[PDB]
Coordinates of C-alpha atoms and ligand atoms in Angstrom, one line a residue:
Chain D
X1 CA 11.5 8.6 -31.2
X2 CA 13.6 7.4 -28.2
X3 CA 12.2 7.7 -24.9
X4 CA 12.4 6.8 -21.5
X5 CA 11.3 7.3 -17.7
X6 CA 12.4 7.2 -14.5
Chain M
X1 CA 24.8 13.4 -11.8
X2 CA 25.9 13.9 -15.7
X3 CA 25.3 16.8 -16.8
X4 CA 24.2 14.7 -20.0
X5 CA 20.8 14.0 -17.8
X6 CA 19.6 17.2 -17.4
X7 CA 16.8 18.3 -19.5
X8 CA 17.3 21.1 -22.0
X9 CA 14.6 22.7 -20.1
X10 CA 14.2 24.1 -17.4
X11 CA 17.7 23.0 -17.1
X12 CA 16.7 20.5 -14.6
X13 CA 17.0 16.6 -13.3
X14 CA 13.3 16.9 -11.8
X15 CA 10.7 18.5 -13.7
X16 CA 9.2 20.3 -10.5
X17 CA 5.9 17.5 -11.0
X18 CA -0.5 18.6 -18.1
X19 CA 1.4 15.7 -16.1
X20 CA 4.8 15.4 -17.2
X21 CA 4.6 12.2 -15.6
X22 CA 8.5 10.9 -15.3
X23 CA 8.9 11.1 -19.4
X24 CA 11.8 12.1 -21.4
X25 CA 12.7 12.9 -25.0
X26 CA 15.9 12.6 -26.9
X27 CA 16.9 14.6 -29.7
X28 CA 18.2 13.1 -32.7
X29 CA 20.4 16.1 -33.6
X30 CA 22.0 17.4 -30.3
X31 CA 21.2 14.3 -28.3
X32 CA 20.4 16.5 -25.4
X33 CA 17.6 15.0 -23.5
X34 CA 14.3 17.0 -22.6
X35 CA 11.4 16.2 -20.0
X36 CA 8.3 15.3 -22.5
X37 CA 6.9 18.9 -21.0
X38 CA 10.0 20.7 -22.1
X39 CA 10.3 19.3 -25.3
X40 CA 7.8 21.7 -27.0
X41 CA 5.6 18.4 -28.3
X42 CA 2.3 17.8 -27.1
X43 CA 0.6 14.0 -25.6
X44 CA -0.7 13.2 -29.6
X45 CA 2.9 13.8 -30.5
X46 CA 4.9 11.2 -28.4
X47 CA 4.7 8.3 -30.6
X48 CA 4.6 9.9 -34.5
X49 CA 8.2 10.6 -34.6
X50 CA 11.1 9.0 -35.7
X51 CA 13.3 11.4 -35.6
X52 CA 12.5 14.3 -33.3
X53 CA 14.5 17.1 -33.6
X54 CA 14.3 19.6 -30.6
X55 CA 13.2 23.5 -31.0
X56 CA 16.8 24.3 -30.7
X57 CA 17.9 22.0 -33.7
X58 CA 15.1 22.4 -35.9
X59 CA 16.3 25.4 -37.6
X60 CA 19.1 24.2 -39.7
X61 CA 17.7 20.8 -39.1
X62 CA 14.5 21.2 -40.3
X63 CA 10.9 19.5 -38.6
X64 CA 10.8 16.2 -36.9
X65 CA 10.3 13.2 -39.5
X66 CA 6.9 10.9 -38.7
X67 CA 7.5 7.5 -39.4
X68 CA 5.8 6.4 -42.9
X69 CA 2.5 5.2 -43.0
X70 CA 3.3 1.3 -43.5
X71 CA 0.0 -0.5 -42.1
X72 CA -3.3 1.4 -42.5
X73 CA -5.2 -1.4 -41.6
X74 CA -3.4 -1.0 -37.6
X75 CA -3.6 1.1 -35.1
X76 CA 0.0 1.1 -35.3
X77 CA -0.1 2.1 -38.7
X78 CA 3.7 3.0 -38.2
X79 CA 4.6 -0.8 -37.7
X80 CA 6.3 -3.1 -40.2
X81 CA 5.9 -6.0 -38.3
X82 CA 2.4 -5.4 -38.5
X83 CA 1.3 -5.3 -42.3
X84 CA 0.6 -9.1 -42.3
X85 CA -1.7 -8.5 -39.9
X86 CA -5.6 -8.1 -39.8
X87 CA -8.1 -4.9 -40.2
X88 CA -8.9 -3.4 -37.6
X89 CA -12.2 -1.9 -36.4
X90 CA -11.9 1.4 -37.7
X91 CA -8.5 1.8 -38.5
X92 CA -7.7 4.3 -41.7
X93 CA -8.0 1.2 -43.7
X94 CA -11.5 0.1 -42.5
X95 CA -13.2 3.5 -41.9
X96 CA -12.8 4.1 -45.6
X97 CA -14.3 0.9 -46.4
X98 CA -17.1 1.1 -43.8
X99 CA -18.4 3.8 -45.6
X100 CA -18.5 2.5 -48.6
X101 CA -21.3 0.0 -47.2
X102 CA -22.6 1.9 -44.4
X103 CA -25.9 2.5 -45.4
X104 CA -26.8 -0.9 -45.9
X105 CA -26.9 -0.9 -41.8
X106 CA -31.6 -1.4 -41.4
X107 CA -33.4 1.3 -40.1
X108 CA -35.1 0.8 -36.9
X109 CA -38.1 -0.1 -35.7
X110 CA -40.9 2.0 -34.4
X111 CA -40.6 0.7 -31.4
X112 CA -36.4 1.7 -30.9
X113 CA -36.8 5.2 -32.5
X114 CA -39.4 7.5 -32.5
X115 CA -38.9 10.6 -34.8
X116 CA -40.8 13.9 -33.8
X117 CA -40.9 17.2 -35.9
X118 CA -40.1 19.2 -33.0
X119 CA -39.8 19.4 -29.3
X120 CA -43.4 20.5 -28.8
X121 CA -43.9 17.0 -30.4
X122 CA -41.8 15.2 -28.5
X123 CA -43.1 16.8 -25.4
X124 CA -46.5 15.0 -26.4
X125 CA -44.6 11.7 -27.5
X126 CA -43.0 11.3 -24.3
X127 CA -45.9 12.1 -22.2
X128 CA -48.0 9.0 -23.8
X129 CA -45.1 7.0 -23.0
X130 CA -45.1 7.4 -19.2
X131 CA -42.1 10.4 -19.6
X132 CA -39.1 9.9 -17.7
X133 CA -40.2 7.5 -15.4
X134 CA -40.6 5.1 -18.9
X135 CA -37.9 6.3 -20.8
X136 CA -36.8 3.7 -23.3
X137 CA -37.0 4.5 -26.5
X138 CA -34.4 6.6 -28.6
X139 CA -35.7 10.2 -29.7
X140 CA -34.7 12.1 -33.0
X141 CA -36.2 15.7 -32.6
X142 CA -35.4 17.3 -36.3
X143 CA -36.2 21.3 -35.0
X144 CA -35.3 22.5 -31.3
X145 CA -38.5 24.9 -31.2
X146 CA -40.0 23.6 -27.8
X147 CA -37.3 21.5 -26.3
X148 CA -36.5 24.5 -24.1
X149 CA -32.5 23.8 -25.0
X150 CA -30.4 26.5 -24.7
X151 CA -27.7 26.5 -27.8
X152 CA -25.8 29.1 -29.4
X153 CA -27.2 30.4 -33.2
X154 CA -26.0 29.0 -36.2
X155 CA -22.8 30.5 -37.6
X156 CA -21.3 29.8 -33.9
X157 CA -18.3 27.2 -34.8
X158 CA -14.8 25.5 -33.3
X159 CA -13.6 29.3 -33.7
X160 CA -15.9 30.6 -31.3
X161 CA -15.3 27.7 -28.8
X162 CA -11.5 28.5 -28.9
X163 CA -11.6 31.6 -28.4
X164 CA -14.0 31.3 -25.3
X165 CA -12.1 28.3 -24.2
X166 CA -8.7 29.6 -24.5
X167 CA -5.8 28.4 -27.0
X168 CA -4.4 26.6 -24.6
X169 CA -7.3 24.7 -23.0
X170 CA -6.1 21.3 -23.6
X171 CA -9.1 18.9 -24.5
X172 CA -8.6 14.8 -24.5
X173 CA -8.7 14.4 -27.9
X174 CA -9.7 10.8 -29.9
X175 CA -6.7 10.0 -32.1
X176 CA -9.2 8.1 -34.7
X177 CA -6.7 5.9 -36.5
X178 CA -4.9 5.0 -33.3
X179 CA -8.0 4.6 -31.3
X180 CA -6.6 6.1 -28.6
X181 CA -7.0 9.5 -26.8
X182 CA -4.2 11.7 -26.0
X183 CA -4.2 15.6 -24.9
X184 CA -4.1 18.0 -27.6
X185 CA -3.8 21.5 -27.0
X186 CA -7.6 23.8 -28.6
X187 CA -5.6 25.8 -30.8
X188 CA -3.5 22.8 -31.9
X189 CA -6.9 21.4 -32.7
X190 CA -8.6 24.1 -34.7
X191 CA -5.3 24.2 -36.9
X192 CA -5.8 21.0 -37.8
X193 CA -9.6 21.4 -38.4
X194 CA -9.1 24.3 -40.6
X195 CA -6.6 22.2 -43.1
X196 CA -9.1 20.4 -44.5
X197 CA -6.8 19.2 -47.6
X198 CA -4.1 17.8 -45.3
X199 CA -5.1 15.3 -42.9
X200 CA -2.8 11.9 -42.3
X201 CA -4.4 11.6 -39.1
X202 CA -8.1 12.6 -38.4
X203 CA -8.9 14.4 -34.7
X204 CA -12.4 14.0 -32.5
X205 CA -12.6 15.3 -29.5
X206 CA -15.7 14.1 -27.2
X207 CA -14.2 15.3 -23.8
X208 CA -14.3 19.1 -23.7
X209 CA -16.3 19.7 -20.3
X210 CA -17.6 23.5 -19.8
X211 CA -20.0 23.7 -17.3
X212 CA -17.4 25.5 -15.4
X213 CA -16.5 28.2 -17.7
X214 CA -18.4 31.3 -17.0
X215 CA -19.3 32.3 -20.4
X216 CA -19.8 28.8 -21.9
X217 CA -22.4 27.2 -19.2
X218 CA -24.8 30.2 -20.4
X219 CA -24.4 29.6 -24.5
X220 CA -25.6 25.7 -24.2
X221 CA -27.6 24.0 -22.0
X222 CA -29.2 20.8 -21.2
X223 CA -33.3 20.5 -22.7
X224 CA -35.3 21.9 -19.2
X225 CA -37.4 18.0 -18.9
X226 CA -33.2 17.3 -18.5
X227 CA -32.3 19.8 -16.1
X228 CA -35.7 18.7 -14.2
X229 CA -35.1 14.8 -14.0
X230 CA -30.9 14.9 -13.7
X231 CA -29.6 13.1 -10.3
X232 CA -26.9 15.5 -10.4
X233 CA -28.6 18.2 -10.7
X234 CA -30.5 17.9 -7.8
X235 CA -27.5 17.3 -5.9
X236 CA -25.7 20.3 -6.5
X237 CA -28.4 22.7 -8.0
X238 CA -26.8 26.0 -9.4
X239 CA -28.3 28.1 -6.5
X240 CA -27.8 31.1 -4.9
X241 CA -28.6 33.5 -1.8
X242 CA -31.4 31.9 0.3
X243 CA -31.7 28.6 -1.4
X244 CA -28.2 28.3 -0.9
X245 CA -27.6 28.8 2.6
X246 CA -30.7 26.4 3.6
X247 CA -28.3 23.9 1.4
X248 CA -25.7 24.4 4.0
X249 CA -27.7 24.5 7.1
X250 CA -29.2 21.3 6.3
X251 CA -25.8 19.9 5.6
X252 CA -26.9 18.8 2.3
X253 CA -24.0 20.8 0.7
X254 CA -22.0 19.0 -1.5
X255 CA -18.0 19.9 -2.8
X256 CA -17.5 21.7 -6.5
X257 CA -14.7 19.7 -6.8
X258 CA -17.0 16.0 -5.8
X259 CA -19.4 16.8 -8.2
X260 CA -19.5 14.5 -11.4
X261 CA -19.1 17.0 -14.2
X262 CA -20.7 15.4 -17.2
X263 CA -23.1 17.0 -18.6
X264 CA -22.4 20.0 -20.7
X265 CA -19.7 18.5 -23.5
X266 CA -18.5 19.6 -26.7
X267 CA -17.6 17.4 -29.2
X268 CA -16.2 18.6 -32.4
X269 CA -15.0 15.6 -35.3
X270 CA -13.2 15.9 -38.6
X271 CA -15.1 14.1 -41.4
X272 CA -14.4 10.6 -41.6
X273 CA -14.2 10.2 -38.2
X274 CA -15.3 6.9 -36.1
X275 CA -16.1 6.0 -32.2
X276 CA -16.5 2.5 -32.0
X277 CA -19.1 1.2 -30.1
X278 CA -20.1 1.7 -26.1
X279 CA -22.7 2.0 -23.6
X280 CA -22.1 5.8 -21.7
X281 CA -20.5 5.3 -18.3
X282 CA -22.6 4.7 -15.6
X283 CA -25.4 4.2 -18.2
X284 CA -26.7 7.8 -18.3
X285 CA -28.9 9.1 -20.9
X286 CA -28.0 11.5 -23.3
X287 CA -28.9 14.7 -25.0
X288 CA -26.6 15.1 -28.4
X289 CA -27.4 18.5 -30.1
X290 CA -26.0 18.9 -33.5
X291 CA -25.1 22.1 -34.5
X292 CA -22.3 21.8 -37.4
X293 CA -22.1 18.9 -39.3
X294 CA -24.1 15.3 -39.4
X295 CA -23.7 12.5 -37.6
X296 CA -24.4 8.6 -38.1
X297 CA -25.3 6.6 -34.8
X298 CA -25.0 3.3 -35.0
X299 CA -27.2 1.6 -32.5
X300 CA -28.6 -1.7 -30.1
X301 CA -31.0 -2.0 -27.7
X302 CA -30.0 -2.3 -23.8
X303 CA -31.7 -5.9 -24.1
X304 CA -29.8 -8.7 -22.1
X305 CA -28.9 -10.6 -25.3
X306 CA -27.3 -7.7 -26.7
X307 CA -25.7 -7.0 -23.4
X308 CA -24.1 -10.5 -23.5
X309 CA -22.8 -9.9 -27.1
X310 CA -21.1 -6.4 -26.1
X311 CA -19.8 -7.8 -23.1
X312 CA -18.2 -10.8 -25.1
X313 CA -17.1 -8.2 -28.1
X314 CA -15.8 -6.0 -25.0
X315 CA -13.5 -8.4 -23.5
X316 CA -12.7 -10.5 -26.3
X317 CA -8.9 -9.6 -28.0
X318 CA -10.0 -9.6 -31.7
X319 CA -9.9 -6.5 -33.0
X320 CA -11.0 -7.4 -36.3
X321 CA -14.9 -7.6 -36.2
X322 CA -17.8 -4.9 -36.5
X323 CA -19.7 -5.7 -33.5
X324 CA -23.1 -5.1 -35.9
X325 CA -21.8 -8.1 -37.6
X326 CA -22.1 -10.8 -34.5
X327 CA -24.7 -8.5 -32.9
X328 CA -27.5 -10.9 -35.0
X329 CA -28.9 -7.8 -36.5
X330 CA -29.7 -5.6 -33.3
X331 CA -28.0 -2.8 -34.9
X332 CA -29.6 0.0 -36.8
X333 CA -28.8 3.0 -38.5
X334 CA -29.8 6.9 -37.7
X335 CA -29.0 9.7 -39.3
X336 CA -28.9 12.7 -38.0
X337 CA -28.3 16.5 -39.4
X338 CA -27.2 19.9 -38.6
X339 CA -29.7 21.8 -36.1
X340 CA -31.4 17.7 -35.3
X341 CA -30.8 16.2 -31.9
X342 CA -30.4 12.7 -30.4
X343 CA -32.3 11.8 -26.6
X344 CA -30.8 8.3 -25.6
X345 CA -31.9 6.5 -22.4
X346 CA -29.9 4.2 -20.4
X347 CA -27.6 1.3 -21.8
X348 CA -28.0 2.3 -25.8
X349 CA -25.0 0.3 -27.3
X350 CA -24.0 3.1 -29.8
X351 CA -21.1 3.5 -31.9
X352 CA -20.6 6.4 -34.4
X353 CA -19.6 8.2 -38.1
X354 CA -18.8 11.3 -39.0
X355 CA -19.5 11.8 -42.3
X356 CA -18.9 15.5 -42.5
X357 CA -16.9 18.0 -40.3
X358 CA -19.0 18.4 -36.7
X359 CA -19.5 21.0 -34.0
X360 CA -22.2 19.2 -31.4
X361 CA -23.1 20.0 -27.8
X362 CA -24.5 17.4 -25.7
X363 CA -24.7 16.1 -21.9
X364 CA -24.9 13.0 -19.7
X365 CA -26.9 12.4 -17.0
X366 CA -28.7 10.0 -14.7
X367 CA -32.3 9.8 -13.7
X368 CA -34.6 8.0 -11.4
X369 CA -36.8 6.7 -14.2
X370 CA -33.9 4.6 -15.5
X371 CA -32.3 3.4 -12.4
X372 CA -32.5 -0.1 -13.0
X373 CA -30.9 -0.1 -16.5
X374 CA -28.2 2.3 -14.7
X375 CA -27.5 -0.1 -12.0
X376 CA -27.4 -3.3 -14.9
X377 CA -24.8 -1.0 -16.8
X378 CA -22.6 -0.2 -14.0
X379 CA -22.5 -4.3 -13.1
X380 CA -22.2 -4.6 -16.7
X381 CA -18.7 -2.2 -16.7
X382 CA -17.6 -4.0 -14.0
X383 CA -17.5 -7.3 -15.4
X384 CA -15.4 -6.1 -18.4
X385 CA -13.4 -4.1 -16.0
X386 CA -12.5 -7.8 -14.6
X387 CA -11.0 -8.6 -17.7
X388 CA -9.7 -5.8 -18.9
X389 CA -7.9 -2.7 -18.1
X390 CA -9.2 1.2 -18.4
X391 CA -8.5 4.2 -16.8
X392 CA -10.9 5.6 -14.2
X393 CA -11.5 8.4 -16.2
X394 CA -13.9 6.6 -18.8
X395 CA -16.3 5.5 -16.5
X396 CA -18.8 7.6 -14.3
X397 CA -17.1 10.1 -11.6
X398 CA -18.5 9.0 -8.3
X399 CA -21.1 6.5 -8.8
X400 CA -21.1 5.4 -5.8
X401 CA -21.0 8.4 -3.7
X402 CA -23.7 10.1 -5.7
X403 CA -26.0 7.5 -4.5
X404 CA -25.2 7.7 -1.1
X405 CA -25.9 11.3 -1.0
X406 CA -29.0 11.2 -2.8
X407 CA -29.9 8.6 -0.5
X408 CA -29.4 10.4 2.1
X409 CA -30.0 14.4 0.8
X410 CA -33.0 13.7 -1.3
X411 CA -34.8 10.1 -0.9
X412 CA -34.5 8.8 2.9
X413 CA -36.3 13.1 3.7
X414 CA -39.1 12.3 1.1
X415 CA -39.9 8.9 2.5
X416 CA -39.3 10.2 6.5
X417 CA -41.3 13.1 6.2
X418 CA -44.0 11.0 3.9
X419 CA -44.1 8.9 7.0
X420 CA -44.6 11.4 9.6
X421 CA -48.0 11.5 8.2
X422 CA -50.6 9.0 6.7
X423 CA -49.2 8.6 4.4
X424 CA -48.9 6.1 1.6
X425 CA -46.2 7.0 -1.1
X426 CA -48.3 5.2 -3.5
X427 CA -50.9 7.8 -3.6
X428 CA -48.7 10.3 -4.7
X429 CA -45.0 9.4 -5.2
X430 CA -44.7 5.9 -6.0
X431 CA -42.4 6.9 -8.2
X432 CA -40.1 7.9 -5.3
X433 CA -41.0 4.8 -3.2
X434 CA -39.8 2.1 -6.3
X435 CA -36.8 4.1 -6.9
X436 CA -36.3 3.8 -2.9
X437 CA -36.2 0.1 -3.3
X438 CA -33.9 0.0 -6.1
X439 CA -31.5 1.8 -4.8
X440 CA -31.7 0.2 -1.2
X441 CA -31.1 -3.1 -2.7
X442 CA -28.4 -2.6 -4.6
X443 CA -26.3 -0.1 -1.7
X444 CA -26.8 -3.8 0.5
X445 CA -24.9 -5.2 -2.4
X446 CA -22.1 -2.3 -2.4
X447 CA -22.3 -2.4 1.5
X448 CA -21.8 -6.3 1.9
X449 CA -18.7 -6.2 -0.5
X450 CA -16.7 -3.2 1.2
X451 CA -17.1 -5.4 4.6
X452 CA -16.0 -8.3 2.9
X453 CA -12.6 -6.6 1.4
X454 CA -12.5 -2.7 2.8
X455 CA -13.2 0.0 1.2
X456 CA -11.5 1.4 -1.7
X457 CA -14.4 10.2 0.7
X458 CA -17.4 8.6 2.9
X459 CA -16.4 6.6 5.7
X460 CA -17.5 2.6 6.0
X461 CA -19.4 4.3 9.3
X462 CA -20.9 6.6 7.4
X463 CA -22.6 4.4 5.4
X464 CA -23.8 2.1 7.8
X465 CA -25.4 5.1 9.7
X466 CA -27.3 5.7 6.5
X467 CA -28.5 2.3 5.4
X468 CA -29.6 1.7 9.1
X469 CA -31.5 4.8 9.0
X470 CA -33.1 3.9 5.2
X471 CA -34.0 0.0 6.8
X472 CA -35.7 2.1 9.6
X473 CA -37.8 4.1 7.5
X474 CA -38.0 1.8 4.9
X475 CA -39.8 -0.9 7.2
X476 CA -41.7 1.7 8.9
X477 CA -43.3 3.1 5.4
X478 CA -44.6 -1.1 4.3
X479 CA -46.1 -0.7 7.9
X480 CA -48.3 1.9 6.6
X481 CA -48.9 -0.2 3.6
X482 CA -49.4 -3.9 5.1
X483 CA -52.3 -1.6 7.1
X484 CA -53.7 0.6 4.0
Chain G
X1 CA -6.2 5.4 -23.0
X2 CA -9.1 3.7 -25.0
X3 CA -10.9 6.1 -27.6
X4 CA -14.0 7.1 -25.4
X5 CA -15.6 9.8 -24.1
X6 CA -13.5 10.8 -21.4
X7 CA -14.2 12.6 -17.7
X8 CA -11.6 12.8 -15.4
Ligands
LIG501 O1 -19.7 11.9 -31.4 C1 -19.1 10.9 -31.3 O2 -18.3 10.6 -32.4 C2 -19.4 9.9 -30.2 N1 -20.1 10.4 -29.1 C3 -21.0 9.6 -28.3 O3 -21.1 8.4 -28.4 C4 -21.9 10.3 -27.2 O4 -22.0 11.5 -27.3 O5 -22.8 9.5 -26.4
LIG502 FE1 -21.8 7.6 -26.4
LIG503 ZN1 12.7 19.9 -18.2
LIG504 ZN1 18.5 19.3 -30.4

């Protein structure tokens, strides 16, 4: 799964 | 702003913040990007995907594809560049073997476990001990009948608990393989659970806390000798009326939202299930009620060569040893079955098995007879803590600051009023007078190390009020005894 | 977050 954050 | 970075949601940049954190989701169909909270997945979820596809793509898409199961012996069982690599403690691949040569694990001694009929037994067993105030040994008590326990009658399972609970109640929930622990939602849970034929991963949840659900806190209880000897308990006694306004006119009143909330759990495990072993934060004693299911503790004494072996096996980064097998035979094996429960004192190194789908209540709690082996735990978590790093979460909810207040609400009264008599506290509460001293000593120890680097809800002032105050009386009760 | 009995 691609993710991220910020 | 592209309108590429707004979240399929809620239709948002910023999720208004359980915590969404600052975590997004992409979908592999749509590519439209989604807030972890507006995806639709849960906290278990976020790393068993490789393709997610979101709620509006799964129709003609069909579900989201979890990566293949390429390591069993890893916690990241989903990782290629990990099949070379060694078993790990208990990973799919070791629980299955640990099983298969489980029972060889010794019995123990008379002197670690002491196995009564029932409670009216046990009552009797712990008396010739010295009670509380001696507590060391491990009790198995195989029928409730005297224990005064409250529990729920048999036929009471995860069903009931969900539907009292709420399908939503989300529960930090032990993702065995992984061995990790990640929010899962109850209902999401008892799915699960009642699949017993499909199971990649296997569930245990430890965590569910319900003293403060109104219906729950009545259906299980902690054994009354519990109740009567909990620190906690007699810091923020469930009181009313009367009893409860001379709680607030003595000031000894104490926040809902302060007090440590640890001792009425549920745990429920799938079969095959393994917690790896531990001491329980702030080195409480427990009460472990099995109502559903069987259980297989795995267990050391709180001795200090045991205590140097955890601590090693705690901060060391293998991950490939049974800590029973460098632990020079300190651990034993106990088995214990539906409607049979488990008293543990302070600083029991414990890990468990789940041999058979589980439903248990149980509690932590700490007590004045085990103070010292509570205080040697909590130096013993913080030494790993040095090395290491854990959320705050797994270790005991105000420590600290329940000390100071019993300090203050319950022992620096006993030993003022004892001394505006006579009065030696030897003659009738020495047991309140060594405890004193304990806890004095080690509060210098917390009090010399805030002044030498600050503090960290109770004011540095506070505290020295209170210490000088305890010194005062402290000094002025040995007077009385240097005389007598 | 470790596998552990857990009280936040
Ligand atoms: O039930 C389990 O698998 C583990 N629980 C504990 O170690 C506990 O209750 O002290
Ligand atoms: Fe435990
Ligand atoms: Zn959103
Ligand atoms: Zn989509």
């Amino acid at each position: 799964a691609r993710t991220k954050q910020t | 702003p592209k309108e590429s970075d707004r979240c399929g949601g809620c239709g948002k940049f910023t999720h208004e913040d359980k915590k969404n954190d600052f975590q997004w989701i992409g979908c592999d169909s749509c590519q439209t990007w989604y807030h972890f909270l507006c995806s639709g997945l849960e906290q278990f979820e976020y790393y068993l995907y490789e393709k997610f596809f979101c709620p509006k793509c799964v129709p003609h898409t069909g579900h989201s594809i979890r990566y293949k199961v390429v390591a069993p012996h890893r916690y990241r069982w989903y990782s290629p560049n990990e099949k070379h690599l060694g078993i790990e403690v208990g990973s799919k691949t070791w629980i299955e073997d640990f099983i298969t040569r489980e029972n060889t694990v010794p019995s123990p001694t008379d002197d670690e476990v002491c196995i009564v009929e029932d409670g009216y037994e046990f009552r009797r067993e712990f008396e010739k001990l010295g009670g509380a105030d001696n507590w060391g040994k491990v009790f198995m008590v195989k029928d409730m009948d005297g224990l005064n326990m409250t529990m729920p009658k048999p036929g009471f399972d995860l069903e009931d608990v969900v539907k009292i609970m709420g399908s939503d109640y989300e529960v930090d929930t032990i993702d065995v393989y992984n061995q990790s622990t990640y929010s899962m939602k109850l209902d999401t849970f008892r799915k699960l659970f009642r699949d017993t034929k499909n199971r990649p991963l296997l569930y245990n949840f430890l965590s569910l806390e319900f003293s403060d659900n109104n219906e729950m806190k009545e259906i299980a209880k902690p054994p009354r000798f519990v109740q009567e000897i909990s620190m906690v308990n007699r810091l923020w006694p469930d009181v009313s009326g009367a009893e409860y306004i001379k709680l607030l006119q003595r000031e000894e009143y104490l926040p809902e939202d302060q007090r440590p909330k640890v001792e009425q759990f549920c745990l429920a495990g799938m079969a095959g299930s393994y917690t790896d072993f531990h001491v329980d934060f702030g080195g409480s004693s427990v009460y472990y009620h099995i109502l559903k299911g069987e259980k297989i503790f795995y267990i050391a004494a709180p001795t200090e060569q045991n205590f140097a072996a955890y601590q090693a096996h705690e901060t060391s980064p293998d991950t490939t040893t049974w800590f029973g097998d460098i632990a020079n035979g300190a651990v034993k094996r106990v088995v214990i079955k539906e409607g049979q429960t488990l008293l543990i004192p302070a600083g029991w190194i414990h890990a468990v098995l789940t041999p058979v789908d589980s439903l248990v209540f149980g509690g932590n709690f700490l007590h004045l007879g085990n103070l010292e082996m509570q205080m040697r735990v909590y130096h013993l978590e913080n030494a790993i803590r040095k090395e290491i790093r854990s959320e705050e979460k797994f270790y005991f909810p105000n420590f600290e600051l329940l000390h100071w207040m019993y300090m203050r609400n319950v022992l620096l009264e006993k030993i003022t009023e004892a001394n505006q008599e006579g009065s030696d506290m030897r003659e009738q509460e020495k047991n309140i007078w060594t405890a004193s001293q304990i806890m004095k000593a080690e509060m210098e120890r917390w009090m010399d190390r805030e002044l030498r680097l600050g503090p960290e809800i109770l004011p540095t002032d506070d505290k020295n009020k209170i210490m000088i105050s305890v010194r005062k009386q402290i000094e002025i009760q040995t007077k009385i005894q240097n005389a007598k | 977050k470790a596998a552990r009995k857990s009280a936040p």
